[PDB]
Amino acid sequence: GAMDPQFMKKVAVIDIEGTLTDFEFWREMARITGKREIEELLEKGLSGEVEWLDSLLKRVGLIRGIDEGTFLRTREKVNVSPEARELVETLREKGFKVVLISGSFEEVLEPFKELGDEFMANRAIFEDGKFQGIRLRFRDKGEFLKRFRDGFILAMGDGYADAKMFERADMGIAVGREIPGADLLVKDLKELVDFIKNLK
Amino acid sequence: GAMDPQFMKKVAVIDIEGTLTDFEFWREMARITGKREIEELLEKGLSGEVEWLDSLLKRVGLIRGIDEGTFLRTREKVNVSPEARELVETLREKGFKVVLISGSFEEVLEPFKELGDEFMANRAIFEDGKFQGIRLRFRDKGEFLKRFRDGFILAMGDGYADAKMFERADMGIAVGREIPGADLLVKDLKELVDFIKNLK
Amino acid sequence: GAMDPQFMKKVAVIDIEGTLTDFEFWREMARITGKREIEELLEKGLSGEVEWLDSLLKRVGLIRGIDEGTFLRTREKVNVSPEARELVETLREKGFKVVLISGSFEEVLEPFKELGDEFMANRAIFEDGKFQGIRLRFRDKGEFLKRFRDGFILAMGDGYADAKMFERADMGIAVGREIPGADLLVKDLKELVDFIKNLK
Amino acid sequence: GAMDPQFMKKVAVIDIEGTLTDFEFWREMARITGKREIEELLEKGLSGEVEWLDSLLKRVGLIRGIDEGTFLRTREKVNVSPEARELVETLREKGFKVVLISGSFEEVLEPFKELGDEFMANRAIFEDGKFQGIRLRFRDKGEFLKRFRDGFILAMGDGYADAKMFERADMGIAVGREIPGADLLVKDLKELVDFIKNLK
Amino acid sequence: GAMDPQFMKKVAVIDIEGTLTDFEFWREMARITGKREIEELLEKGLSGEVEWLDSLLKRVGLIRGIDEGTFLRTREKVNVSPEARELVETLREKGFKVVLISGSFEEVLEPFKELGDEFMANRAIFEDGKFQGIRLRFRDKGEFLKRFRDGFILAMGDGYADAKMFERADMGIAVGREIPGADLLVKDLKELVDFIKNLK
Amino acid sequence: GAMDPQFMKKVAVIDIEGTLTDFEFWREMARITGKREIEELLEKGLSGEVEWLDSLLKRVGLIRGIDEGTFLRTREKVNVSPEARELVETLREKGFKVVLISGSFEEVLEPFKELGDEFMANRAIFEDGKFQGIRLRFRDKGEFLKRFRDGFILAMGDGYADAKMFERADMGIAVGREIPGADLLVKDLKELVDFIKNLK
Amino acid sequence: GAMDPQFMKKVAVIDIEGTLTDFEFWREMARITGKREIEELLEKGLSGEVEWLDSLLKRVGLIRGIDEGTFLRTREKVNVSPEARELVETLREKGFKVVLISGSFEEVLEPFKELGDEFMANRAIFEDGKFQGIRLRFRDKGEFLKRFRDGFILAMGDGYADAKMFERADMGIAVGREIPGADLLVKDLKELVDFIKNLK
Amino acid sequence: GAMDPQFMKKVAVIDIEGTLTDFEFWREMARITGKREIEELLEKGLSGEVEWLDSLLKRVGLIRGIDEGTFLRTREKVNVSPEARELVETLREKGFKVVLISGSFEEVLEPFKELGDEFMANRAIFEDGKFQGIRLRFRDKGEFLKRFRDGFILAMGDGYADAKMFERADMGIAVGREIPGADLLVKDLKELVDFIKNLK
């Protein structure tokens, strides 16, 4: 009988934000609510001026109570581009099992849910039709990569990734801005696609 | 309550077949195709008269070419019962993250896809609408459990599980027939629900 | 039969001093004896100006000979506050096994002895009714956390904790003054209670 | 002598039942309730005719509802004998840290709570003064010993221990009946005391 | 396509004898020398009637002094068949790095030296053109596989392999006679080629 | 029977470039093509001004399309010197198994292929008689040394090695320019030979 | 030759009794004291009819009080033979570091104390010139071998060794009687010397 | 039978030079030979101005050829002081197994050979009555401590020790000059004796 021995394949992990999409949930939330503190907390988090979990929970705090519909509607701004799909299809062609990860909400990044072979993000807590908080489903992206510790890992990411994710990977590629731990920096998604297309 | 620290929770792994459903894809394939050899191969696999992967791939071979529609028709025999739903909801109340697994096809077990916190099974290969083979997405259920090695695990399963899976669990419960390595044996899903309801 | 599977629960470790109580044994000893060197050695230890074990043993040296009664009477100044109890009860509610730790004396922190699910501190050596020295019952708080290496750990602490304790934890919260390794800083016990109350 | 480096000492673990006391809670429960099934379940557990946890939880089930007073009355049958006290004091003289363990209830084994340097057993759940179930505070005695994995262990035990516990020990002594994995068998507690007195 | 990330690929290990060739050096040595004891020692080794290394070194002893020319003449009986070449080329197409191993001599198995991506076997010691002994370049085939412990392994082998080698493999295939630890048994090299051709 | 227990021997790893030869493929390529960017990228890589993999792939990019013959002809400039051979023969004399490694092409460093006991370098991809790219056969020299993790390692290297390789070694010797992690610096190959000759 | 890198060498461990000497301390004690029970206990230990430590301590008990002079007189029966010396010297020539071990007394095996590169055995306790007991300086011979876990080990031994010791060895040789776990069996010390002389 | 379970005891490792003795072999060699370079190389080594192995081998180089008698006579300047003996006897009293280590020559430090329970130093190579070189018997003192990794370690040392040794220890005490990694600094041997005398 025919088999695709997927479990034995080198793994390609893609951190979605800043690689596959430029949609940024917290910037959208800042825009929607008019609360600039949201975006400022985001910048403090990205820069390392405050601890990541701290800025994250403060942002969650700032949108507590917002309508579930307003929240879920942000999904309408998320799309899988032909280029994003091209990256993923090509990785499969080149023999990778593809895993998409994000620290944002599965509810919002839903369009990516079946794109790769596995998908993982955080989730949202709704009560009586209002957003209440976040389900933290992995500690950080570094820890999440431990799921694939028995094999090799190519990791691709951008501004929402950090050195913790990259030092778990056997090869790491940053997209658009250098990330400590990454072996390569490519200038944009198109260039990442070109690199992968060159594989074999 | 703006935060569910899901990543830190003890894991409740449920092997779907023989716990949540009595649907058995290969017995159904034997019925539909009339190929008794399929069910015989299953019996040989389950009893350990032949190696499991050997038996599985031989079964896969015997349904090569079967139409995707015939294949997908079987999901009509797969339903989330009130009891199965109560098990999973109660597990969450009792502070578990719930992971549903199977060595059968995700496409057929689709009704369970969103019931737990995580879902994992094998997948099917279709070419021009006809079944070509299996995508093996984990080596075996014990190997899969290594995904949750950093915390504690309660495993529940039935006839499609074995000692390898239960060896990984901190506490294991078999349903309906003793399984080597399980700590406990409950009579049926009802008894299992009652047991979980007694927790804490 | 009903069970609380306590052994499988994520662990909440609380460093008592500066989280649950502001009683500080060595400052009390300085006050009682009039020996300011005691408190100066404490400051040198906390600041890292001298190695921790060194300043500790020097402090022990300075109270050698003090009456066992005078020593044990300091317990009268220690109380479990409603807020401290609230923190611990709420952690249990949210599914944690609670472990209280301190590098101070079990004899003095006795009121906390049965508050959590486990309790660990150092002990005192008395001979002929006088204090002679210290029983060091764990190397440091980092090493002590190894007891719980098979599961997840939330750690909470203040001025008597350090980076060694926090890097062993999966999530760390400092109270009242930043501690390297901690993910979050809350301003006081009340705020820590509020954070935990928000869990699930 | 202002310092006892207890954390560095070899560990003497004593399984309480059948070494320090001949009190057997479940045999007493069978006597008090008249439910012979309780003792039969114990015998089945001890002989391995049924899985240990299966047997334990069935026993727990059979005393659901029993009054806390009836439960606590049994501690009257638990006493620290001169010999048991001599064992523990001599172990300390011989340079061991002493850890007393049991799979029975801390509430009943209270007389031993402060005898050793550390004490660990399971706990009981009472609701409105009536027994509801067991808090399992460690998976089994072997798993518990992992707490002391960084040093050496001498284990002493009797009928309620097994190979799992002794496999963890650097040297194991059984009392009164051979236990798989123990290096030595002594006739009774007196012989054990004599053996320890011969050390160094 | 300016890059083949070979180091990241799943490894296909082939034990040469009984998979790619039916040449058996020791049976040939028995034929050439007329020393039946050589083949008897082989049979005793293969059946486990005597320890493998004991048997191997006894065989080595029995050909001490044999001319290098006689030794090298045997490579004339070793040829890369179209089928053997197809196996290796197809494995590469299917995304494997191919490692050929044998416990026999590299000097005799020279035709296979460049067929795979890596090649490993034992070597011969010649002094003044006469055979003196064996260079053992790995302990056994299982130990050798530790070289590829950081990724996944598909192992293929026949009569000169054993459980030790297959225990190391994530998936193992035996050819022509069942081998303990192999998942699958294929009839002959043709069947093996067909199996690999079915991958992905 | 006589044996050379090679598998049990301490391992001597030699990074070829700058120890055994001063031939530098990328400088030769710069010379041949007239493309100074090649050599500049090399300097940026060696100095750590760009990530190693990044400068490597950029260099590969710059010679894509070059005639396979021009490429392979560079081998004519590579020779095993008497001194290089002396180093290797002496290491064997002193009881080492010798492993030669390089990040350059096996096709070009071919003259060294059978010098040591094992040989490993990267390889070249040719299509229609033109160079297309590189096969990366190990992640870096540090990772490659993991192959020999079960024994002791003496490592010798120069300008194409780095701290990653040396911290895997039990003793490290740099040749001609200091390398972080190296225990010793010798001034040239002759001096390295002298050091090894002094062993035992 | 100003340097012997001894720490890097493969280790040759020799269990003294039954390889280098046929002196058996306990059989001699049985002869001198006339206590047949001593030799019977030895036989029971060697055959595994009783646990080894149990048997050893019972033998130790039976010679309590024996004069140090009587004890030391036995070293007259322990001599380094020309063959034993040749084994050790040849092992060094062949590039091994030589470690001599025994579970018997260093005081009696004193003639071997400086023969190897390292020497380890148990020791005796004398009080006022009379034998009081044994100092157990390692748990068992397998545990002792963990000392050399960072390199390779060739183990040689006879009747006082077991599978535990040989399991630790990369290659094991028994002398005079098969021992579980040994790869090879040689007839006597002469054969062993001849085997080692054949190395490299 | 009586036993001293030495193998189970916490280990006290003493780096001899600068704790037990102020004899400094290389300073004596400088004095004897008049070669000031010897002492300068020593200072460069101690200060970290040159790599330790490098300065060591250069010093060895500078005394190559010196009379074996002149070399061995330096032993006459080495004595076990009452204070040194007091330290060691007291450590045994307080339940430690005592291990003495040095990077100097066993031949010269011979008077310490039987002081502790184990002794380890480097050794000298003599040929035709002249010093030829050094046998390096352990990599460094940190690596040597791995021998005792299964238990706890108290380490004491001075100027010839470094952070590598101390970070392997559970408690570290420096004597006379601070050493990175040490918990405590005592001013001289007398004070170290006083500290140990205070133990229990």
Q: Write the DSSP assignment of B36-53 as a string of letters.
A: HHHHHHHHHHHHTSS-HH
Which residues contact residue G196 at a Cβ distance below 8 angstroms, ignoring those fewer than 6 apart? G87, G90, G91, G94
Among candidates G124, G127, G134, G130, which has minimal Cα distance to G58?
G134
The rounded distance, in Å, linking the Cα atoms of H195 and H199 is: 7
- Rounded to an integer, what distance in angstroms lies between the CA atom of residue H167 and that of residue D69? 53
Written as six digits, the tokens of D148 are 């002391």
Closest by CA to A6, choosing from B130, E94, E193, is E94
Compute the distance between CA of residue B127 and CA of residue B138 in angstroms, rounded to an integer.
Answer: 22
Alpha carbon dihedral D150, D152, D157, D160, in 10-degree steps, equals: 20
B4-39: b (≥16 Cβ within 10 Å) or e: bbbbbbbbbbbbbbbbbbebbbbebbbeeeeeeebb
Closest CA to B98 of B110, B111, B87, B82: B87
Q: What is the DSSP letter of F27?
A: H
Q: For residue D84, what is the enclosing H or E element?
A: helix D82-93
- Assess contact for E10 and A6: CB atoms under 8 A: no
Please state whether beta strands E130-135 and E118-127 pair in parallel, antiparallel, or not at all (unpaired): antiparallel
Beta bridge pairs of residue D126? D131
Q: Do the Cβ atoms of F71 and F64 come closer than 8 Å?
A: no
Mutate to test the interface with H, among C41, C53, C143 (most CBs of H within 10 A): C53
Enter the tokens of residue E85: 């070449």
Architecture of domain G1-20+81-199: 3-Layer(aba) Sandwich (3.40)
The answer to whether C51 contacts H171, with C-beta atoms less than 8 Å apart, is no
d(CA C161, CA A57): 23
Please provide the size of chain E in residues: 200
**Residue F15 and residue F102 in contact, taking contact as beta carbons nearer than 8 Å:** yes
Beta bridge partners, H19, equal none
Q: Within an 8 Å CB–CB cutoff, is residue C200 touching chain B?
A: yes
> Which tokens belong to E162?
């054993």
- Coil, strand or helix at A100: strand
- Give the residue among A199, B133, B71, B124 at the shortest CA–CA distance from E199: B133
Q: Does D93 touch chain G (CB under 8 A)?
A: no
Helices (H), G13-81: 25-33, 36-47, 52-62, 68-73
Compute and round to an integer the Cα radius of gyration of chain A: 17
Residue ranges of chain A that CATH labels 1.10.150.210: 21-80
CA F149 to the chain's CA centroid: 19
- G152/E94 Cα distance (integer angstroms): 37
- Give the closest-approach CA distance of E195 to chain G in angstroms: 36
- Do G60 and G94 touch, CB atoms closer than 8 A? no
Q: How many CB atoms lie within 10 A of CB E1?
A: 13
The residues that bridge with C44 in the sheet, in sequence order, are none
- Dihedral class, residue F141 (left if φ above 0, else alpha if ψ from -120 to 50, else beta): alpha
Listed in order, the ranges of chain C carrying CATH 3.40.50.1000 are 1-20+81-199
Shortest Cα–Cα distance, G139 to chain D (Å): 7
User: Which residues from chain H sit within 8 angstroms of residue G146, using beta carbons?
Assistant: 150
DSSP E strands in chain D: the ranges are 3-4, 11-15, 97-105, 118-127, 130-135, 153-157, 171-175, 184-186
Q: What does the H/E/C string look like for chain H?
A: CEEECHHHCCEEEEECECCCECCCHHHHHHHHHCCHHHHHHHHHHHHCCCCHHHHHHHHHHHHCCCEHHHHHHHHHHCCCCHHHHHHHHHHHHCCCEEEEEEEEECCCCHHHCCCCCEEEEEEEEEECCEEEEEECCCCCHHHHHHHHCCCCEEEEECCCCCHHHHCCCCEEEEECCCCCCCCEEECCHHHHHHHHHCEC
Whether the CB-CB separation of E164 and E179 falls below 8 Å is answered with no
Asked if E touches G (at least 3 Cβ pairs < 8 angstroms), the answer reads yes
State the SS3 of D127-178: ECCEEEEEECCCCCHHHHHHHHCCCCEEEEECCCCCHHHHHHCCEEEEECCC
AA letter at E64: R
Q: Within 10 Å of residue G170's Cβ, how many Cβ atoms?
A: 19
Nearest CA distance, B47 vs chain D (angstrom): 22
**φ and ψ of A34, to 5 deg:** 75, 5
Nearest to A131 by CA among A112, A113, A107: A107
What CA–CA distance (Å, rounded) separates A28 from A72? Answer: 12
Instruction: List the single residue in D with minimal CA-CA distance to B179.
Output: D51
Dihedral pair phi/psi, residue C169, rounded to 5°: -90, 150
Instruction: Give ∠ CA H2-H4-H6 in degrees, rounded to 5.
Output: 155
Q: Does F49 touch chain A if contact means CB atoms closer than 8 Å?
A: no
* Rounded CA separation G20/G81 (Å): 8
**DSSP H helical ranges for chain G:** 25-33, 36-47, 52-62, 68-73, 82-93, 141-145, 163-168, 189-197
- Separation of first and last alpha carbons in chain H: 27
Whether residue H17 contacts residue F148, with contact meaning beta carbons closer than 8 Å, is answered with no
Closest CA to E174 of E22, E43, E12, E18: E18
Task: Chain H: give the shortest CA distance to residue F103, in Å.
Answer: 27
How remote is the C-alpha of G100 from its chain's centroid? 7
Q: Is E122 helix (H, G, I), strand (E, B) or coil?
A: strand
Partners of residue C105 on adjacent β-strands: C122
DSSP label of G121: E
The bridge status of strand B171-175 relative to strand B184-186 is: parallel
In a 3-state reduction of DSSP, which class is residue D76? Answer: helix
A108: helix, coil or strand? coil
**Residue C114 DSSP SS3:** coil
Contacts of B29 (CB under 8 A, 6+ apart): B35, B38, B59, B62, B63, B66
What tokens does D165 get?
A: 């516990």
CA–CA separation, F186 and F195 (whole Å): 9
Q: How big is chain B by its Cα radius of gyration, in Å?
A: 17
Gap between the Cα atoms of F146 and E147, Å rounded: 8
Matching residue, tokens 């005898």: D115
Kindly indicate whether the domain formed by D21-80 is annotated with CATH number 1.10.150.210: yes
Determine whether the interchain pair B54/E184 forms a contact, defined as Cβ–Cβ distance below 8 Å.
yes
Residues in chain B: 200
Task: Tell whether the torsion through CA atoms of G1, G3, G4 and G9 is positive or negative.
Answer: negative
The Cα of C98 is separated from the nearest Cα of chain B by a number of Å equal to 14
G139 touches chain D (CB under 8 A): yes
CB–CB of H137/H2 below 8 Å?
A: no
Distance (Å, rounded) from C-alpha G119 to C-alpha G144? Answer: 12
- Say which residue the tokens 């904790």 belong to: C161
Whether residue A183 and residue F51 make contact (CB cut-off 8 A), yes or no, is yes
Task: State the number of CA atoms in the 13 A half-sphere of C154 facing the CB.
Answer: 23
Closest to E98 measured CA to CA, from E82, E121, E114: E114
Sign of CA dihedral D124, D128, D132, D137: negative
**Cβ(G16)–Cβ(G100) below 8 Å:** yes
- Interchain contact, D171 vs G133, CB within 8 Å: no
- Model resolution, angstroms: 1.8
Q: Which two tokens stand for residue C123?
A: 């002990």
**Cβ–Cβ under 8 Å, residues C142 and C125:** no
Identify the burial level of H183 via C-beta atoms within 10 angstroms of its C-beta, where 0-12 means exposed, 13-18 middle and 19 or more buried: buried
- CB neighbour list of residue H149: distance below 8 Å, 6 or more residues apart: none
Q: Are F87 and F196 in contact (CB under 8 A)?
A: yes
Tokens of D156: 């002493």
Q: In chain D, which residues have their Cβ closer than 8 Å to the Cβ of C146?
A: 150
How far D122 CA lies from chain C's nearest CA (Å)? Answer: 9
Length of chain A in residues, anyone? 200
Whether residue E198 and residue B133 make contact (CB cut-off 8 A), yes or no, is: yes
Positive or negative: CA dihedral A14, A165, A10, E115: positive
Instruction: Find all residues with CB under 8 Å of A135, minimum gap 6, and list them.
Output: A122, A123, A124, A125, B3, B4, B6
The answer to whether F128 faces chain E, any CB pair under 8 Å, is no
Instruction: Report residue A52 CA to chain centroid gap.
Output: 15
Q: Does F113 touch chain E (CB under 8 A)?
A: no
Q: Which of F5, F70, C150, H8 is nearest to G199 (CA)?
A: F5
Angle of helix D52-62 relative to helix D36-47, nearest 10 degrees, comes to: 170
Q: Is F53 on the interface with E (CB under 8 A)?
A: no
Output the six-digit token pair for A96.
Answer: 């990778």
Contact A139 B60 (CB under 8 A): no
Do C5 and B150 lie within an 8 Å CB cutoff? no
Interchain contact, A2 vs B134, CB within 8 Å: yes
* Alpha-carbon gap, residue E180 to G172, rounded angstroms: 24
Instruction: Determine phi and psi for A167, rounding to 5 degrees.
Output: -80, -10
CB atoms A95 and E9 under 8 Å: yes
> Euclidean distance between the first and final Cα of chain E, in Å?
21
Q: Which residue of A has its CA nearest to B9?
A: A137
Using CB atoms within 10 Å of the CB of residue D50, give its burial: 0 to 12 exposed, 13 to 18 middle, 19+ buried. Answer: middle
Alpha carbons B150 and B168: distance in angstroms, whole number: 12
Torsion, Cα F78 F84 F88 F89, to 10 degrees, reads 110
The sheet with strand B153-157 has its strands ordered as A2-4, B130-135, B118-127, B97-105, B11-15, B153-157, B171-175, B184-186
Angle between helical axes of C36-47 and C25-33 (0-180°, round to 10): 150
Contact partners, residue D87, CB within 8 Å, separation at least 6: D14, D20, D189, D192, D193, D196
**In this structure, is the dihedral angle defined by the CA atoms of residues C3, C6, C10 and C16, taken in order, positive or negative?**
positive
Residues B65, B68, B69, B72, CA torsion sign? positive
Angle between helix E36-47 and E52-62 (nearest 10): 170
| Cβ-contact E154, E143 below 8 angstroms | no
Rounded (5°) CA angle H61-H66-H68: 120
Question: What whole-number distance in Å separates Cα of residue F105 and Cα of residue F25?
Answer: 8
G143: phi > 0 → left, psi -120 to 50 → alpha, else beta; which?
A: alpha
Q: Pull the structure tokens for residue E191.
A: 């069947």
Q: Hey, of C154, C183, C186, C196, which one would you mutate to test binding to chain A, going by the most A CBs within 10 A of its CB?
A: C183
Listed in order, strand segments (DSSP E) in B29-117 are 97-105
| Dist CA E96 CA E7 (whole Å) | 10
Number of H helices, E strands in chain C: 8, 8
Residue numbers of D between 158 and 197 with CB closer than 8 Å to C: none
Chains touching A (at least 3 CB pairs under 8 A) are B, C, E, F
Q: Distances from the Cα of E157 to the Cαs of A25, E101, E172, E180, E182, in angstroms?
A: 53, 10, 8, 11, 9
Q: Distance (Å, rounded) from C-alpha C115 to C-alpha C102?
A: 14
Matching residue, tokens 């799921």: A147
> How far apart (Å, rounded) are the C-alpha atoms in residues F115 and F123?
18
The chains found to touch F (3+ Cβ pairs under 8 angstroms) are A, E, G, H
Residue G109's region, left for phi above 0, alpha for psi from -120 to 50, else beta, is alpha
**Strand D97-105, strand B118-127: pairing:** unpaired
Rounded Cα–Cα distance for residues F133 and F59 (Å): 10
In chain F, which residues have their Cβ closer than 8 Å to the Cβ of H52?
183
Q: CA dihedral in degrees (G4, G7, G9, G11; nearest 10)?
A: 130
Q: Which two tokens stand for residue A136?
A: 């933290």
